[PDB]
Design a protein around this ligand. Structure first.
Ligand SMILES: CO[C@@H]1O[C@H](CO)[C@@H](O[C@@H]2O[C@H](CO)[C@@H](O[C@@H]3O[C@H](CO)[C@@H](O)[C@H](O)[C@H]3NC(C)=O)[C@H](O)[C@H]2NC(C)=O)[C@H](O)[C@H]1NC(C)=O
Ligand SMILES: CO[C@@H]1O[C@H](CO)[C@@H](O[C@@H]2O[C@H](CO)[C@@H](O[C@@H]3O[C@H](CO)[C@@H](O)[C@H](O)[C@H]3NC(C)=O)[C@H](O)[C@H]2NC(C)=O)[C@H](O)[C@H]1NC(C)=O
Ligand SMILES: [Zn+2]
Ligand SMILES: [Zn+2]
Lengths: 255, 4, 255, 4
């Protein structure tokens, strides 16, 4: 038999950690229904931020707030299903997912997104910061939401999610307004870029686009982009702000 | 949330 | 502040391991070089297995067989490359990568594949086991050679890799001589299928194939399959044997 | 061996 040599030679520059993205979700259930399904159901996530004002949560004996780890980061949780971002897929492998309890709703298929709880958010930024500091390849655009990786079969973490706040806190990507505007103007005057340029520019940001984009799809896409970066409205409707935002990110957060 |  | 609750709820069933492939490459470089390139160069591997009969390896101050770890399994080493296997790509993310010092050669090109020192093989054998035991989604099909993932680009680990020997140690996949002969029978009478179909077979077995295949690639595919499962000859021409193996494999390892 |  033969024991392994962990001390003689260690690689330094040419290597990274496996995890790249941090993805965000709303459970869509009350806590108990959420621990159950993320611990024994058919999915899971690495971390779970409860909504402290949840009867089930308090019932379970929690004063809260807490953050719960359901799967250590080393391992692979199931939250991202069929995915894609930044030229990848099956992001379950390569990401860390966070689930926050928030009973957003699909009602065939009108939607309803409750505001999050503050503590819940202060927790989140706290956690999310702890991750980012530990994965160096988790650049700002890689802090994403299911909706972005799973367009438009998913819509968490939903437009009630204070990204910009998180940006402000160092977490995830956001545009310099100046640069946004510079595009808005340019677009209003010089008109708008062909779909071609757009899709592509959407791709570059990260979005996993199919070969061929029905406007039907497009909607889903814009929608998603919007609930993230322009949640003031997320009608799948090609705007100039919306489009300006895009290039404003692609300017600041480029290849 | 949701393997693949 | 908020500490985390690693004890209250733990995902049992619905999660997985981060890693599900194990890849094998040969360096084509002596030891001293080999370590150099994998610790500071532009790639790396989790485990390096040296050939004791390497003057550099002795110069280095080693004598007998060792196994060095350069990058912990937990992390993502840059070994695999632009790759793909089992509907996944960028295998580098989900691989543990093993390199074996072997002075192989491209004479720009004619290949020269030196036998593997027994010693390396026994070590590899044990390591593979060791690993395989702890990554329950490393099915036999998922112990693969570079050549299998990066078809046409890479010719590691080569044919002098005793894949079968490993199989028997419980490492990697192999076909039942019996079931192969059945298949060899049919193609002998029924006829060998058309590329179209064969490809679905490779495709099925794992080989991440391109959108289209030309004769030149198809060689590489066949070649690369050959060096793994019919090293007896890997000119990349189409044998009944080669196909029989393929089909037999697929039959034996649904997946 | 070899990012992507
Ligand atoms: C218990 O599991 C949670 O359940 C909710 C559903 O209440 C999960 O979210 C829902 O997930 C599906 C896919 O898993 C989404 O997909 C929708 O699917 C049909 C398929 O034909 C399409 O018609 C819809 O267009 C497609 N897209 C939309 C927006 O519906 C559901 O929509 C999605 N609903 C929401 C609000 O996200 C949720 O992810 C699960 N989370 C857990 C257990 O934590
Ligand atoms: C220094 O690191 C080692 O060096 C090279 C990496 O550049 C590796 O060996 C050789 O790798 C190339 C591909 O990696 C193979 O040769 C050629 O590959 C290119 C791909 O662009 C093809 O265009 C060519 O068709 C192909 N050569 C042909 C057809 O002749 C070789 O297979 C390989 N050399 C051998 C002997 O196998 C090596 O793996 C690196 N090892 C490290 C970093 O440890
Ligand atoms: Zn989700
Ligand atoms: Zn290699």
């Amino acid at each position: 038999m033969l024991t392994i040599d962990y001390n003689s030679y260690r690689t330094t520059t040419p290597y990274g950690k496996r995890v790249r993205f941090l993805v965000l979700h709303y459970t869509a259930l009350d806590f108990a229904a959420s621990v159950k399904a993320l611990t024994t159901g058919a999915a899971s996530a690495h971390y779970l931020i409860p909504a402290p004002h949840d009867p089930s949560y308090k019932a379970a004996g929690f004063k809260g707030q807490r953050i719960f780890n359901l799967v250590a980061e080393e391992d692979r949780a199931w939250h991202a299903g069929v995915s894609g971002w930044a030229r990848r897929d099956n992001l379950n492998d390569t990401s860390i997912g966070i689930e926050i309890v928030n009973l957003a709703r699909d009602d065939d298929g009108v939607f309803t997104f409750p505001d999050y709880e503050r503590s819940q958010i202060n927790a989140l930024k706290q956690l999310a910061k702890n991750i980012l500091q530990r994965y160096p390849d988790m650049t700002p655009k890689n802090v994403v939401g299911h909706s972005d990786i799973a367009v438009g079969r998913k819509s968490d973490p939903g437009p009630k999610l204070p990204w910009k706040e998180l940006y402000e806190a160092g977490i995830g990507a956001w545009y310099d307004d100046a640069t946004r505007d510079r595009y808005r103007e340019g677009f209003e005057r010089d008109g708008l870029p062909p779909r071609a340029d757009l899709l592509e520019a959407f791709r570059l940001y990260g979005y996993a686009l199919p070969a061929t984009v029905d406007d039907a799809y497009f909607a889903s896409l814009l929608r998603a982009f919007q609930m993230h970066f322009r949640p003031e409205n997320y009608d799948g409707a090609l705007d100039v702000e919306t489009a300006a935002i895009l290039y404003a990110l692609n300017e600041k957060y480029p290849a | 949330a949701x393997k693949x």
